[PDB]
Nucleic acid binder design. Structure first.
Ligand code: ZN
Length: 60
DNA sequence: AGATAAAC
DNA sequence: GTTTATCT
């Protein structure tokens, strides 16, 4: 039940992987990934109503 | 969960 | 070049 777990980095409640930060900040995996890229705070301008999805990667 | 690779 | 979701 992650209803209420608002991503402390982008306020998104729908996430592909709830990255529970050790400090106690539930941040949607997307924030944890891009954060590792530039190591800065993500503006939720790229957020969306439901979890984004596409042609799932074919089983390799 | 974390890692991988894909797709735009 | 760049970013995230689904994969395992
Ligand atoms: Zn987030």
């Amino acid at each position: 039940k992650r209803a209420g777990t608002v991503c402390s980095n982008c306020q998104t409640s729908t996430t592909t992987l709830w990255r529970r930060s050790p400090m106690g900040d539930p941040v949607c995996n997307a924030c944890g990934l891009y954060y590792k890229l530039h190591q800065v705070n993500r503006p939720l301008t790229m957020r969306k109503d439901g979890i984004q999805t596409r042609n799932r990667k074919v089983s390799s």
